[PDB]
Design a protein around this ligand. Structure first.
Ligand SMILES: Nc1nc(=O)c2ncn([C@H]3C[C@H](O)[C@@H](CO[P@@](=O)(S)OP(=O)(O)OP(=O)(O)O)O3)c2[nH]1
Ligand SMILES: Nc1nc(=O)c2ncn([C@H]3C[C@H](O)[C@@H](CO[P@@](=O)(S)OP(=O)(O)OP(=O)(O)O)O3)c2[nH]1
Ligand SMILES: Nc1nc(=O)c2ncn([C@H]3C[C@H](O)[C@@H](CO[P@@](=O)(S)OP(=O)(O)OP(=O)(O)O)O3)c2[nH]1
Lengths: 487, 487, 487, 487
């Protein structure tokens, strides 16, 4: 088992340990080779045709590079090859469990297919990791390369998802993967304290390189300016005190990428319509589970033998199906094929301090259809013809500043960690880190319906004291004069 | 129908005419959205996950740009918007007909599935264009935008494939798409005289950008240094006389891309094994054709209603199939999934002026198994365990210099065209433009079989007076001393 | 006079009109070939070795591209080749007048060498343009290519500097370069209404490409999404309504470039010390003016015959001089050569609404030396050993939002212009657009002096109720506990 | 003395050892900050404004990276930090001695200013290194960081120039810098056996990045595929056997860069004219040497105190000089300023196996003026009005294949080195590695003189049986019919 090298386009050549090569060369990992990282973005950005396989390889490589650099800079941390291999394995296998198209399954399909279950892709990745290890017989190979599987597997699971048995909430680090003195290893692959991790850097670089946008972050500079320092009696990764501006720039880059590509109108509506097609085709798609069992699309997240075959393939299954049962879903997919998409109406910005929770997402069309515009409307619409899409823009921490939970070190004292407040960096920084934006769409493709939907949406926005739409004075100029505050 | 813009990663923003938008928004074009441009290269280069949809859009955009620039530079050519739209449509719809994985279907699957038929992807693209036009009702829209479909469609077909009714061979341009004075329009999308066309530039740029290699060509400089000049009583596109070095560099870049990425050992063997899986699964895959007819994978190239659904999907059809009939093909695909690939043995270079034709491709394993090495071999192999792979490296014209069929103009006389010979450019240019290289693989994964196959291959190479393999003195050092000429 | 092409690294190939070729091939333009765009940044960023010649060529090319695109999109604007040539000439000759190192001369050297005169580089560019035209005999060539010099020269001067004879302040556009209907041509090269112009885009791209930072702006998308629309009875260039986020991103990119490269600590101190060397060497450097007159460095801005030879050369004049008169300046330059720079002390942020004006810049060291820290200091410092450096960070408009003066158009009404407020875009935008930051340096290189200067600076910051320094708890931990508000 | 980091645009962030920081922060190294790497290329490619300072830093960084990687891969080589520091210092100080504009001084100015002396820039770099060490007192610092100056300085000199005392020619490595077992350290900075070294990679990347051309080489892949293997009883750096194609591509990239940018027509003529200006201004420029001595431009290569101040500054010295003695040189420089360059005539290719040596370079204009064309010429020219420019294109080894002196290793035997012949790689490789091309220019700018010079040049080419010029049938169509072999 000789070391293997791959020519990645973002990170050049990547060297992979033989244990990593054995882990990737399994069906549970090659399943990621057929899942798009940007599901609905491929139908808006033609170049965004990259899967999660490359992203997983890159995240593993970056985690290995960061841990190797941290070990080289501070030999006193006692970082062994076992820790390097474990953090690399956590990096590669952090996205093992993803549904088709990789985001609507986790955030739109499952919440509608089965709202009772609470499912997230990290849990699916953990279960797929267990299935991979058990099915492929990886533990002998792990023991061959100096790894202790009984605790290394727990360490990898804790890296991927966090505290396994229960939330900590007591006992002062009752963890079972690594001791207290290795507390800096729970932040390399998925940092749950401030969000700065190699996963963010990798998808930043890859998405910018593929979409056609330019990236405004340099992870190598952060790597060269990061040191492990004792913070409140545990070792946390700390950055140089002059890098706070670059960290704010990283979060601004995340916000801009979400604004421009991940929350596109057409991409969001296409994801919604593919989700509707999946919901309509759920009852007639059967996936062979374990021991000959048959599983639906929505129920395949309970058996990883079936979930291994639940990839982007079901889209072309429905599209090419001749079964009359799947007719409605096939028609929806063909409407997508003809770009007969649902029509955009408008956006808004809630202004009150209270934001609408996910429990009220489906009640919005009812209120939208209840509007009573004082304009000559020749057609009356129904909530069935209205679609709302609530989007939350944040910095990884909803209401809290992610930089407020970062520790910095200076040149004079390379081992003392300090906190830098927002006002000590610049006065040209965002005053808020959470905002909400609501889209509204129409399912009809006739101009009269478009006019009626626009009037209803503008009247609804004016009713609940929402923001003035960016083009409220053109599409519906008969309602804005009523809103005195808007002018 | 307002003009639409797409954010391509290679060409930035691209503006599309409403007729183009109508042409692309059809199932026959979105079928390209699910066909990888590099079939087996995705399993060697992780980043090469780009389809033919983006490539078609880019080729159309580049054809439009080139024709617009040529029209602007020389207003006397009388280039109308009709010609621009026609060349753009030829650019977008030049790769409509591609099989799954886009290259093994055209060059490996069909020649083995049905050797009697002579099929090429240009013919399939022509038939898919006909089907698109007829099914989607494009002719009224073409007439709406000033196009004459009866001759414009013939012009587009001639652009894609060439002379439709028969080879010219007489009558001095009996063509029916465009008059003699527009002879320079048959070279923008697919140049069949010297090979310089926007298709080459687009896949150069895209493949370099995605694989991870750097490109050594600048198409914008060629565009700025190209003029239409009368050549032997027809108008041909001519380049500046100082660009001959850059053209040779373009062909060298093509050769290097073929050498490094398109002819990779692992990619070629993976394509061969997927082709074998398709051949084994042919008899049990049915695609619903026109009017309820059922078509196989190999017979779906006779009905474009069925061929519209023959994409990369059949790979995951076979892989995820529970049908016991498809068991052998499923096992082959799972062997691919486990990276239990066939093992590399060696390469060679024919030295005689006579190269082995495609008619003798399948007879090579018989001669390979017939070798009698004078070494202690404990296992005897069979031709069934041997795979050969003949690769032809050329410049687009097999034995002829492509630059020998290019006309150049100078600054003093911007309308007189001249020919530049090879010796007038440099003495550091290739003396030959055609070479052949033969790979040999083994289907067994035991070291004894590897040793036996290596000995057989080395003895076969020494028997027929072939070149000494690049590592013939290490893998098999007991045979090279016999070859006196090799040392 | 045939059209010429140059291979720029940022904009690829650039085609230049013969009038432009004649204008550039003069000493007054090649003088820019020896003036660094980033004066003190070359001694911090090794790659920033680009002059103003390339920047001028790029700005001219971008102005030509923008005007050509605007003319093509709207033929009703009646844009002739005369306007294209005039805006191009304004683009190339917008930075003709720059001092050595191009920024300290305009903003640091002249205000200290002769505070009485009010001089800016635009005035010098105007006078150099006049001198170029008169000396090289350009007017016959301008008349040869259809330009009317008597008004075209006035138009170019108005583009470079604005209203020539007097501020408008009345008469409703009494301009003498172009009529009212061409009001959109005063914004292509140097936009004085909102700051969006090709100069910003060009130095963005070039500085990012040379420093080593990545750019977060796409000017081509803005070009494709810009239209001329009547605004308050004059034609102004308007952007698409969906581009407000990208415009805010452009201003954020400007802020980040200023923060990271243009306001660097070492670069600023090196510029200050080179300015001091120039001030000390002023009295002994003579430049031959017009008619044999002799001019100093500071007085050469009154005669463009002398100013044509006042480039970055005087740095090496002083450095290599054997004249004992220039000894002090030579010693300062050699101290720069040995990197025996003045030592950094700290930075601060004024918190009061009132900012300190440039009239009080030199009075700050007096107040700094007057501090009385309650720490054991064994050495007392003087204001002569203290250097302050006030930096203003803005968006091009000091206290005003630059986007508040931009007009937008929508797809439904491509000719009606609207205003978009900040709250209608996002709640994650800066609440302020002006901030001030003050650096402090020490001229001595002994650690005791460093400690004393740090204590004095921290006490001064605590005295005037300034912000807490980002490392006030380490370099001087004995003063921060006194500031209760800081903790 | 803490480690310092610089943000290079090509290599990102570079970490520098404190000894390196002390070595660079001297006048003898900052002298490179004002010497253009491409002298005459800056007046053809506007973006090529990069000096030798960045190139030296990059070469040092790449040498350090290569040696560190080689040490990490093979711990048995016993590579200490002393060797790393020594190879880094050799990398930074490999181009210390360069004349103004960095190439015409070494290859055109000195051979004409003083043909008796044999001077090369490596000797000047060695003497500048000696002067730097002695003047700045570096030896105590070298001893502080574990370096043995008496032998380390000899090792660095041997790296820069080779055998110091005498050519080896006997004694089987009588070297005095490093023992026989460290023979692989004489190839990292300047490889004199096959030419593959970090200097080539660095200027490849930097020149491509600045000119505007795209690079076709990846040095990181070569670094990852390079191992030290015993070859003929000494340790040489060997590459992977599959990298022979990439090495040939590297040499092809060098050839293309020379063809397109380093041997440009206008750049070469501008370098020639600046050399002529220097030759005319030699007698009136005095540089203060050591102990008050005065040195000319040509005689400043005998005293490094004077040579430290001989940079690109003398160009602006001559250009801005008011001394009537320098009038002719000032006029030549102003002719350059006005782009009144000498006019191009044509190029040729010698066909005989014997090439014309440098001893006959100045005799060519005499033979050119002696031509007797059989055309109606109204003006007779003189050899004084003719300029020839002989250019040699090679692969770093004049008549020999550089890859013929490279050793390769395979995966099966990572310690046995083998030789790969050209015919074992491809049949599409150059058959010759040396070619010669001769340019001819005219000093007059009247069309009649241009016609006369073109006729004379074409007749001269036809006389000596040279190649047919690429445009011999247009500029002079009355002579080519005489040359029967040319048609
Ligand atoms: N570089 C870039 N930045 C962005 O901010 C951005 N947003 C989209 N795109 C890409 C996505 C596509 O590839 C392309 C078109 O996006 P457009 O949003 S202008 O298109 P429609 O949805 O039709 O908007 P309209 O309401 O005017 O009809 O640009 C972008 N590309
Ligand atoms: N990318 C690129 N490749 C090349 O091969 C090349 N050669 C030059 N340039 C750059 C150098 C300049 O920046 C620009 C113009 O070079 P041009 O050689 S077309 O110009 P003239 O010398 O005037 O040739 P003419 O005989 O027709 O007048 O292109 C090049 N740029
Ligand atoms: N990419 C990049 N981003 C930045 O924000 C930045 N700032 C500087 N540089 C470049 C400029 C140089 O090329 C390099 C070093 O800059 P550094 O500011 S870390 O160095 P010192 O001034 O010595 O800071 P210290 O106070 O720790 O001693 O990085 C930067 N490079």
């Amino acid at each position: 088992d000789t070391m293997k090298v791959i020519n990645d386009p973002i990170h050049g050549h990547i060297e992979l340990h033989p244990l990593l090569v054995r882990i990737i060369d399994t069906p549970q990992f090659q399943r990621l080779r057929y899942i798009k990282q940007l599901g609905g973005g491929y139908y808006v950005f033609p170049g965004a045709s990259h899967n999660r396989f490359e992203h997983s390889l890159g995240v593993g490589y970056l985690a290995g590079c960061l841990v190797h650099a941290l070990g080289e800079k501070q030999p006193e941390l006692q970082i062994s090859e076992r820790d390097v291999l474990c953090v690399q394995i956590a990096g590669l296998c952090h996205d093992l469990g993803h549904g088709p198209f990789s985001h609507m399954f986790d955030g739109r399909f499952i919440p509608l297919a089965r709202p009772e279950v609470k499912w997230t892709h990290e849990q699916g990745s953990v279960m797929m990791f267990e299935h991979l290890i058990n099915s492929n017989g990886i533990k002998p190979v792990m023991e061959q390369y100096g790894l202790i599987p009984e605790e290394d597997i727990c360490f990898i699971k804790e890296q991927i998802v966090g505290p396994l048995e229960s939330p900590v909430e007591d006992s002062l680090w009752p963890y079972k993967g690594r001791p207290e003195n290795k507390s800096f290893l729970y932040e390399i692959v998925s940092n749950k304290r401030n969000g700065i991790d190699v996963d963010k850097w990798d998808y930043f670089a890859r998405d910018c390189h593929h979409l056609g946008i330019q990236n405004n972050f340099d992870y190598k500079r952060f790597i060269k300016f990061a040191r492990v320092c004792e913070v409140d009696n545990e070792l946390r990764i700390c950055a140089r005190d002059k890098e706070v501006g670059n960290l704010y720039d990283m979060f601004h880059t995340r916000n801009s990428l979400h604004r421009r590509a991940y929350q596109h109108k057409v991409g969001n509506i296409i994801d919604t319509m593919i989700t509707d097609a999946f919901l309509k085709a759920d009852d007639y798609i059967e996936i062979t589970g374990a021991g000959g069992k048959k599983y639906r699309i929505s129920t395949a997240i309970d058996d990883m033998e079936a979930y291994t075959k639940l990839t982007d393939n079901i889209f072309l299954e429905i599209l090419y199906s001749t079964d009359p049962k799947l007719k409605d879903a096939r028609e929806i997919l063909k409407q997508i094929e003809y770009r007969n998409l649902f029509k955009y109406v408008g956006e808004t910005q809630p202004t009150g301090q209270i934001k609408i929770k996910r429990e009220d997402y489906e009640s919005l069309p009812k209120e939208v259809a209840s509007a009573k515009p004082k304009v000559l409307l020749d057609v009356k619409l129904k909530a069935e013809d209205f679609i709302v899409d609530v989007i939350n823009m944040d910095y990884g921490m909803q209401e809290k500043n992610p930089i407020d939970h970062v520790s910095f070190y200076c040149k004079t004292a390379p081992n003392r960690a300090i906190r830098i407040t927002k006002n000590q960096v610049s006065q040209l920084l965002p005053e808020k880190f959470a905002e909400q934006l609501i889209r509204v769409y129409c399912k009809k493709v006739d101009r009269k319906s478009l006019y009626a939907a626009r009037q209803y949406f503008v009247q609804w926005c004016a009713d609940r004291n929402f923001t003035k739409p960016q083009d409220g004075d053109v599409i519906a100029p008969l309602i804005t004069p009523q809103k005195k505050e808007w002018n």
